[PDB]
Design an enzyme around this catalytic site. Sequence first.
Site, mmCIF file in Angstrom:
data_model
loop_
_atom_site.group_PDB
_atom_site.id
_atom_site.type_symbol
_atom_site.label_atom_id
_atom_site.label_comp_id
_atom_site.label_asym_id
_atom_site.label_seq_id
_atom_site.Cartn_x
_atom_site.Cartn_y
_atom_site.Cartn_z
ATOM 1 N N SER A 24 -4.016 0.258 -9.881
ATOM 2 C CA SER A 24 -4.813 -0.553 -9.019
ATOM 3 C C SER A 24 -6.135 -0.899 -9.663
ATOM 4 O O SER A 24 -6.695 -0.095 -10.398
ATOM 5 C CB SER A 24 -5.179 0.286 -7.822
HETATM 6 B B1 LIG Z 1 -3.122 1.798 -7.172
HETATM 7 O O1 LIG Z 1 -4.174 2.973 -7.654
HETATM 8 O O2 LIG Z 1 -1.974 1.665 -8.351
HETATM 9 C C1 LIG Z 1 -2.489 2.134 -5.668
HETATM 10 C C2 LIG Z 1 -3.620 2.221 -4.651
HETATM 11 C C3 LIG Z 1 -3.116 2.057 -3.229
HETATM 12 C C4 LIG Z 1 -4.066 2.524 -2.146
HETATM 13 C C5 LIG Z 1 -3.328 2.934 -0.883
HETATM 14 C C6 LIG Z 1 -4.249 3.235 0.279
HETATM 15 C C7 LIG Z 1 -3.541 3.745 1.525
HETATM 16 C C8 LIG Z 1 -3.130 5.213 1.453
#
Ligand SMILES: *[B-](O)(O)CCCCCCCC
Lengths: 164, 548
Positions: free
Chosen positions: B1
Site C-alpha cells: 500500500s
Molecule cells: B497495503 O499495506 O498493501 C494494505 C493496507 C490495507 C488497509 C486495510 C484497513 C482495514 C483493516
Amino acid sequence: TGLAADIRWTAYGVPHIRAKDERGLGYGIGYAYARDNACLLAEEIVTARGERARYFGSEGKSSAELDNLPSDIFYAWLNQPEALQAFWQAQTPAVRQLLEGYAAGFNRFLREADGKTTSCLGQPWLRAIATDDLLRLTRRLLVEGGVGQFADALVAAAPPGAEK
Amino acid sequence: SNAIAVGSERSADGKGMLLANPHFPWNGAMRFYQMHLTIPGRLDVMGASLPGLPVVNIGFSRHLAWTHTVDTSSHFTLYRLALDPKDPRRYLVDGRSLPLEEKSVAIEVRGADGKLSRVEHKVYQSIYGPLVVWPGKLDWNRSEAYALRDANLENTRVLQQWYSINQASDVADLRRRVEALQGIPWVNTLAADEQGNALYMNQSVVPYLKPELIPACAIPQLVAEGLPALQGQDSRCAWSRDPAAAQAGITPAAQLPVLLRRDFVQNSNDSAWLTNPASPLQGFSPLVSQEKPIGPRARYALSRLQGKQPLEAKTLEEMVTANHVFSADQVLPDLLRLCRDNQGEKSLARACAALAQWDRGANLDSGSGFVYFQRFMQRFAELDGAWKEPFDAQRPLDTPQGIALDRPQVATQVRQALADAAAEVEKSGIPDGARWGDLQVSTRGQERIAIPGGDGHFGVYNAIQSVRKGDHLEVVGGTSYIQLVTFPEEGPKARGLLAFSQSSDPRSPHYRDQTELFSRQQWQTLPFSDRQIDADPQLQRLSIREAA
Ligand SMILES: *[B-](O)(O)CCCCCCCC
C-alpha cells in the site's frame, strides 16, 4: 425497535445510506452489500465458522488458499462460543446496533433475492446470517496481523513420539 | 500500500490533500467495497470498507481524509518454550513444570458419499497461547516448542475505533480518538485536513516490553531472522504492563511513532523511520519501528515529494498512473552498458534489444523489456555484492545504486543472470511483440480486461500482483480502492476508483464497469455532497424498513 434506511446509488453502484440511528444505518449497509456481494459474504462466513469441509469436502481450499480442513480447525478454534460471547459483551451499544442492523439488512435481501445479482441462489450455504457471523469475520480480520498467519502452523503442532 | 498526505506548506492550494492507494486482494474476505454513510447531524463519511464491517475503513468526511498501510510493527510474539525433560507436554516457567492445556475441536467433513463424518483435532495451548510448528525451523521436539501470543486476540475495540474515526472532525481530533482507544490492529494511519495538517501515526496494537528486558528476553538468532521471538521459560519476559495502555500488555500511545507536519508524510510499508526524511523517526522499540533500508516504492515516492515545488492533485494521481518501474533506475543503465559490451553474444541479443526499447513502465503498451527485466531482477536479487554502491545508512534515499561491473566476478555473474533470464522468457510462450497489457489481465466471465501496473517489489507505485494461469497473468491483488481527496471551499473533492468494481458477482451491472475504467486509468468523481449525488444521471433510490 424499527429498522429503516434510505439508500441512494450513484454511478458504478456506490450506495449512499441515510438513517436516523446505527440500527437503521447498518440495515442499509447490509442490504446494499448483499445486493452486490451476497455470495462472497456467504462463502467467507462459512470459512470463518469453520464449515468449509462440511459444505465442500476436504479437497478444496478457502479464498486465502488454506486447505478446507486445517482452515476449519483454525477458525473453529479461533471463533469458539466463549470468545465470541466475550467479544460481543465488550461492544458498545452503537456498535451492537450497527451489527444487528447489518445482519437484518443482509437477511432482507436474501429473502427477496431472485437471482438478478446473485449467482449462488439455491446453494445450501447461502443463508440468513447472525451478528455472531459478523463477529467471526471481525476476529478473522483481527488475527491477520498475528496468529492468522500461522494457521497451518497451529494445526500442524503435535507433540513428539518415540523418535530419535 | 501507498499513502501520501500533503499539508499547507506544499499543496498548490495551501490546504490538505490525501492520496490513498492500498494494495489488497481482488477477491475474498479483504475485498474493498465503496459506501457513503450518513446519520444526519452527527455522521457523514464516505470511503471503502472490508466485507462484513458496518464502518468505513478508508475514506473522508467534510474536513478530513484518512487512509492506512500495513505497518512493520510486530503484533504478536513467538515464545520459545523450554520443555520438561521428563515430559514434552509440559514446559518450564521459572524452573517450574507446567502442563499444556488441550482444547479439542470437532469438524464435520463431507465425503465422496455426500455423507458427513466428524473429525476431532487437539489444539495444544500454553499460558502464552497455542503452540505452532514450522517443520525445520520451529519444531516441537523433546527439548523445545513454540507458542504464539497474538495481541489482537484481546482487541475488542477495533469496530468502535473505526466508528470513532468515522466521526472525527479534523486531524487533531482523529489523533485524539485513535490514541485514546488504541483499537487499530495492524496498520499505519495517514491523514490530511482542510486546514492543511498532514498526519502519520504508527498507532496500532503492539506487544510491549520495557527496554531493559529486550536484550535478554529476545531469542537472538530468531530475531536476527525477523521473528519477534521471546524466551518463554522466564516469567519476566511476559509483556510489560503499563496503566496508560488501553489493553494490558500493549504499548502506550505515547511510545508509538507519530508525525504531525504541514509539508508532507508518506508510507509504502516500510517502518516509521523515513516517513519524512527532514524529521526521521527513531528511538523506538524494535517491536515498533526499526531503521531498515526502504523499499523502492517509498524511495520512488520520496524522489517525487522532496523539494520546494508545490504538489497538485494531478501530481499525486500521476505518481500512480505513470506505472513507472522505479527499480529500473538503479539497475537498467548499467545493465544496458553490459549489453553494449556483449554484442555478438546471440543469446543476449533478443533480451538486450527488448530492454533497450522498453519505456521502463508497466503500462498496457509497455514492451517485453518489462518481462525480461523482472526475470533478471529476480536473479539479480540473489547475487552477493553486485551493487556498485551498497545501501548506505547515511544516504538512505539514494542507495543501493548501480551494478558493480568493475568487479570481474560480478560482471560474469550478472551476464549469466541475464542469459538465464533471457532463456527463461524465450522458453515461455510470449508472442512476437506482445505488450504487457496482452499478458496481464483480469478475467470477467469469459472476457479479459488488460490491467496496467506491476509488482511493488520492482518499485511500481501502482502495485499489481498476478499469477500465471494458462496463457496469461491473472491479477490477484494490488491497487484496489483509490481515493484522492482535496478540500475546495465548496466541499470535499474526492477522485478515484475501485479497480475490481463494486460487485464480485458476474450477474451484476457493477461486476466490471470500474475495471474497464481502471484499465484506461480514468479516475472518477466520488460524489459526497447532496448536490453531487443529485447531479448524477444514474441516481437510483430505495427506502426500506422492517419491524425489530
Ligand atoms: B497495503 O499495506 O498493501 C494494505 C493496507 C490495507 C488497509 C486495510 C484497513 C482495514 C483493516
